[PDB]
Amino acid sequence: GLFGAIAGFIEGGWPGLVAGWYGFQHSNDQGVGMAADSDSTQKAIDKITSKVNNIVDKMNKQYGIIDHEFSEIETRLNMINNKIDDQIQDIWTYNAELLVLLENQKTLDEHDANVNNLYNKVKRALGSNAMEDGKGCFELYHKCDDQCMETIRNGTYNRR
Amino acid sequence: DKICIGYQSTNSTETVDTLTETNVPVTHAKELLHTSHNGMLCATNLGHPLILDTCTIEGLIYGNPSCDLLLGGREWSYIVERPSAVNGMCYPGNVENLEELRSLFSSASSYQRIQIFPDTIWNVSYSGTSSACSDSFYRSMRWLTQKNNAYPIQDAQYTNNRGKSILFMWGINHPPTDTVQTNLYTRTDTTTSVTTEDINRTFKPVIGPRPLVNGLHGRIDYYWSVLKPGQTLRVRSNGNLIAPWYGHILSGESHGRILKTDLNSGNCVVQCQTERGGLNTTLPFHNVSKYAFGNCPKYVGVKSLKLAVGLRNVPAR
Ligand SMILES: *[C@@H]1O[C@H](CO)[C@@H](O[C@@H]2O[C@H](CO)[C@@H](O)[C@H](O)[C@H]2NC(C)=O)[C@H](O)[C@H]1NC(C)=O
Numbered sequence: 423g424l425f426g427a428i429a430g431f432i433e434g435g436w437p438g439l440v441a442g443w444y445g446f447q448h449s450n451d452q453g454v455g456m457a458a459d460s461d462s463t464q465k466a467i468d469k470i471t472s473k474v475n476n477i478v479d480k481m482n483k484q485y486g487i488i489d490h491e492f493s494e495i496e497t498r499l500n501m502i503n504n505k506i507d508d509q510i511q512d513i514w515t516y517n518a519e520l521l522v523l524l525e526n527q528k529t530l531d532e533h534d535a536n537v538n539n540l541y542n543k544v545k546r547a548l549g550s551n552a553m554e555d556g557k558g559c560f561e562l563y564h565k566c567d568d569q570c571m572e573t574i575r576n577g578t579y580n581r582r
Numbered sequence: 583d584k585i586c587i588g589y590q591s592t593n594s595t596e597t598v599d600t601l602t603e604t605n606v607p608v609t610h611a612k613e614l615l616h617t618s619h620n621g622m623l624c625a626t627n628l629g630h631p632l633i634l635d636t637c638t639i640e641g642l643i644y645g646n647p648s649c650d651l652l653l654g655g656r657e658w659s660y661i662v663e664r665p666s667a668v669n670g671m672c673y674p675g676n677v678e679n680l681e682e683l684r685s686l687f688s689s690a691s692s693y694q695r696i697q698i699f700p701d702t703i704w705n706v707s708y709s710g711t712s713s714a715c716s717d718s719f720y721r722s723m724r725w726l727t728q729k730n731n732a733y734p735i736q737d738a739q740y741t742n743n744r745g746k747s748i749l750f751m752w753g754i755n756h757p758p759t760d761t762v763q764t765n766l767y768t769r770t771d772t773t774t775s776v777t778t779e780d781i782n783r784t785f786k787p788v789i790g791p792r793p794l795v796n797g798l799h800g801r802i803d804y805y806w807s808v809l810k811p812g813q814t815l816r817v818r819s820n821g822n823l824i825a826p827w828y829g830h831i832l833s834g835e836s837h838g839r840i841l842k843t844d845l846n847s848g849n850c851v852v853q854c855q856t857e858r859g860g861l862n863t864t865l866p867f868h869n870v871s872k873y874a875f876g877n878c879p880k881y882v883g884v885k886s887l888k889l890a891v892g893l894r895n896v897p898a899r
């Protein structure tokens with residue numbers, strides 16, 4: 423994808439990440455575990471929720487078409503009316519279909535960007551204290567217990 | 583020790599399309615298209631529809647003797663004309679500008695009859711009837727004929743002081759033979775005029791047999807017009823006039839629809855009504871019918887409009 427993280431260098435998703443879209447998994451003497459990153463997930467939730475609400479608000483207006491009756495000598499008017507109706511329908515259907523297709527691409531790429539940004543934030547915080555394994559993980563050069571891991575997650579890691 | 587960044591995967595089977603890929607698996611999605619309806623004709627925020635099961639709109643307007651249940655007046659959100667509605671113009675003849683009459687009527691939200699010319703004003707017979715019209719005649723007009731072998735020039739006036747426009751109707755009879763013509767109007771050469779401050783219409787009869795319709799060779803050409811507030815309607819005739827008797831005061835604005843279906847009606851209320859059924863929804867689109875009316879989403883001719891909410895669903899395994 424555009425930002426290279428989702429289905430990118432971070433090859434697969436985690437079924438164990440139940441609370442949100444993005445998160446951290448740590449591995450140390452005490453064990454292995456994962457949890458969603460609340461900050462990044464909630465910000466993403468608010469944005470997509472706004473996009474959905476705005477699309478609904480912008481696209482829910484109806485257009486009115488009455489099935490008018492025409493006499494035998496109003497065939498031209500009948501055709502002109504049909505032309506109007508057919509194009510009103512075709513233009514709006516095109517607008518609706520394209521808006522969904524195009525925004526879908528943006529939505530998927532925005533998630534990719536959020537994962538990329540979270541990854542880069544941690545990379546920057548760790549500095550030379552870790553090496554990238556190239557699959558989304560950072561191999562720490564020093565022992566890091568649960569409290570240490572928490573400073574990385576909440577962005578207060580000391581050694582940046 | 584290590585810490586990794588990752589993203590959620592689920593057993594969601596939802597998929598969405600983009601311009602560069604179709605059926606993309608996603609963790610969460612939202613269908614924006616409403617596709618269900620109740621298969622019934624219901625009331626809308628404007629009220630219940632006027633359902634015509636035996637009479638057509640013009641049959642009601644002209645007062646076909648088989649439509650008496652409608653004489654009392656009605657109000658509606660929309661009109662439904664059942665395929666069983668066959669009582670229109672019982673006596674052979676056509677309505678000038680019928681499509682406009684039906685449109686005007688359907689656009690209103692109610693009608694109330696008003697008497698224009700009382701039976702007492704005439705100096706000729708007014709109770710003419712026909713076997714084609716249930717051995718009776720229209721409730722909106724009077725078939726004026728000779729009385730005591732005489733038909734003096736009839737000249738009647740009516741001024742609209744109701745503050746609202748009045749839709750009125752009249753007709754011109756065309757007998758099948760010269761005997762019927764003289765027999766009914768005493769003369770074969772007549773002149774009828776229907777005038778107001780705005781219109782100046784005149785008519786002449788043409789005797790002769792037309793093809794059989796409802797067992798009759800004669801005809802009645804039907805006409806209509808609208809008397810605005812303050813205007814005066816004047817009719818003059820020395821024969822062949824099917825005089826205005828009662829007119830209609832049209833009021834308000836309905837959805838302005840005339841649905842022609844046998845779809846079941848129900849004791850229900852909906853936001854959006856279509857000729858296929860009604861619906862309630864907060865989704866922005868629907869694919870039920872482009873003819874939908876009321877408080878509706880936007881009609882779009884597709885089967886689905888799935889918007890991605892979550893991310894691409896990528897299985898680890
Ligand atoms: C990030 O996590 C660290 C470690 O869990 C938090 O630091 C602790 O803060 C508490 C405050 O009650 C202190 O009592 C501890 O001594 C701290 N632990 C150490 C040794 O660092 C820190 O507060 C968290 N920061 C955020 C933004 O939540």
Ligand SMILES: *[C@@H]1O[C@H](CO)[C@@H](O[C@@H]2O[C@H](CO)[C@@H](O)[C@H](O)[C@H]2NC(C)=O)[C@H](O)[C@H]1NC(C)=O
Nearest residue numbers: 702703704705706734735736737738739817819
């Ligand atoms: C029927 O005949 C009566 C009487 O001839 C008409 O009424 C008269 O009409 C004139 C002119 O409109 C008035 O000046 C008189 O005052 C009226 N007198 C009566 C008897 O009311 C009446 O107009 C005729 N009706 C029709 C349809 O022609």
Ligand SMILES: *[C@@H]1O[C@H](CO)[C@@H](O[C@@H]2O[C@H](CO)[C@@H](O)[C@H](O)[C@H]2NC(C)=O)[C@H](O)[C@H]1NC(C)=O
Nearest residue numbers: 620626627850851852853854860861862863877
């Ligand atoms: C669709 O919405 C309409 C109103 O928007 C609902 O109609 C209500 O029906 C109840 C039935 O007891 C009435 O008490 C309310 O007064 C009605 N609302 C109004 C103001 O008209 C209708 O029930 C909804 N239908 C569905 C799909 O449940």
Ligand SMILES: *[C@@H]1O[C@H](CO)[C@@H](O[C@@H]2O[C@H](CO)[C@@H](O)[C@H](O)[C@H]2NC(C)=O)[C@H](O)[C@H]1NC(C)=O
Nearest residue numbers: 615616617618868869870871883884885886887
């Ligand atoms: C409106 O949308 C529906 C839903 O996509 C269209 O599809 C039918 O939906 C029903 C119920 O979900 C299925 O049982 C049918 O098999 C679907 N038929 C197909 C293949 O389209 C439905 O056709 C649409 N209606 C209109 C008026 O086009």
Ligand SMILES: *[C@@H]1O[C@H](CO)[C@@H](O)[C@H](O)[C@H]1NC(C)=O
Nearest residue numbers: 437438591592593594897899
């Ligand atoms: C998800 O699907 C897998 C494979 O079908 C199954 O083993 C697992 O229990 C499912 N998890 C859920 C959503 O309960």
